[PDB]
Amino acid sequence: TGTPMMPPVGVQASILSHDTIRITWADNSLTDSRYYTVRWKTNIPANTKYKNANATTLSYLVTGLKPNTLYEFSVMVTKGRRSSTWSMTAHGATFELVPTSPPKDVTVVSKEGKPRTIIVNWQPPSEANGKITGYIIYYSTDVNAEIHDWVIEPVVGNRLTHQIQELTLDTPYYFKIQARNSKGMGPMSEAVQFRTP
Ligand SMILES: O=S(=O)(O)OC[C@H]1O[C@@](COS(=O)(=O)O)(O[C@H]2O[C@H](COS(=O)(=O)O)[C@@H](OS(=O)(=O)O)[C@H](OS(=O)(=O)O)[C@H]2OS(=O)(=O)O)[C@@H](OS(=O)(=O)O)[C@@H]1OS(=O)(=O)O
Numbered sequence: 429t430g431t432p433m434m435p436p437v438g439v440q441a442s443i444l445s446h447d448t449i450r451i452t453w454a455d456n457s458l459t460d461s462r463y464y465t466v467r468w469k470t471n472i473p474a475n476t477k478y479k480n481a482n483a484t485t486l487s488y489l490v491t492g493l494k495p496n497t498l499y500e501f502s503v504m505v506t507k508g509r510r511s512s513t514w515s516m517t518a519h520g521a522t523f524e525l526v527p528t529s530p531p532k533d534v535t536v537v538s539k540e541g542k543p544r545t546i547i548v549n550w551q552p553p554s555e556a557n558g559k560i561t562g563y564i565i566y567y568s569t570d571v572n573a574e575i576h577d578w579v580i581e582p583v584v585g586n587r588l589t590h591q592i593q594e595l596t597l598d599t600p601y602y603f604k605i606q607a608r609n610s611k612g613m614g615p616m617s618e619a620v621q622f623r624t625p
C-alpha cells in the first residue's frame with residue numbers, strides 16, 4: 429500500500445454502430461482483486477451526468493448510445509482500498525441511423541393564380557439521427573389507398589418546400605412526407621388533407 433495507483437494509459441475509442449463504441453486501454457502497472465471503472469458522457473451540453481461501468485479486462489463495450497452523437501470517455505483503476513485518478517479522455521462519435529421521426533409541421537397551400545398547383549411546406553424531423561440528404565412526398569385522392577398506389581414525388585436535397593403541378597380541381601388530396609439520410613428512409617408524416625379550389 430504505497431498509494432495512489434497509476435491511471436490507465438492508451439485510452440482508445442472504436443466506433444462499432446449507431447449505439448456502440450468500444451473502449452480499450454493499457455495498464456503499465458501489471459489475476460489480483462483489481463477492476464476498472466469506465467465513465468462516459470455526451471460532449472454537449474457541457475454539464476451532463478456521467479454513466480459508469482465495471483470491467484476486469486483492458487476493454488469495455490459502451491452500449492445503448494444515441495446515434496450521430498459525440499461522447500467523452502475515461503477509465504480508472506480500483507484495487508482494494510486504493511484507486512487511480514481518471515485517465516486521459518478519449519472521444520468517439522457514434523454512427524448515423526435511419527431517421528426515426530417523421531418530417532413535422534406539414535402544410536399544403538394553393539399556388540397564387542394556378543389552382544391545379546400546390547405548395548407543400550414542412551420542417552425537418554426531430555429524431556433525424558444524421559444529416560438529412562432529402563425527402564419523399566406521397567399523395568393520393570384516397571387516404572385509405574396502399575402507399576404503393578400513392579403518387580411519388582421525390583424532393584432532392586434538404587429543401588423544406590416543393591411544388592406539385594397538374595392536379596384535379598375541387599378534389600380532396602392527401603399528403604405524407606418522409607425524410608432521408610445516409611442510412612435510409614425514416615417514417616412518414618400523418619396524412620394532411622387539402623381540397624383544391
Ligand atoms: O513492498 S510490499 O511488498 O510490502 O508492498 C507495498 C507496495 O509495493 C509496490 C511498489 O512499492 S515498493 O515495492 O515498496 O517500492 O508494488 C507495486 O510494484 C511492484 C513491481 O514494481 S517495482 O517498483 O519494480 O518493485 C509489484 O510487486 S510487489 O513488489 O508489490 O510484490 C506490485 O504488483 S501488485 O499489483 O501488488 O501485485 C505493484 O502494485 S500495484 O500494481 O501498483 O497495485 C506498491 O504499489 S505502488 O506504489 O502503486 O507501485 C505496493 O502496494 S501494495 O498495495 O501492497 O501492492
Ligand SMILES: *[C@@H]1O[C@H](CO)[C@@H](O)[C@H](O)[C@H]1NC(C)=O
Nearest residue numbers: 463464465479480481482483
Ligand atoms: C463496480 O463494482 C463495485 C464493487 O466491486 C461497486 O462499488 C460499483 O458500484 C460497481 N459499478 C458498476 C457501475 O457496476
Ligand code: NA
Nearest residue numbers: 558559609610
Ligand atoms: Na446523411
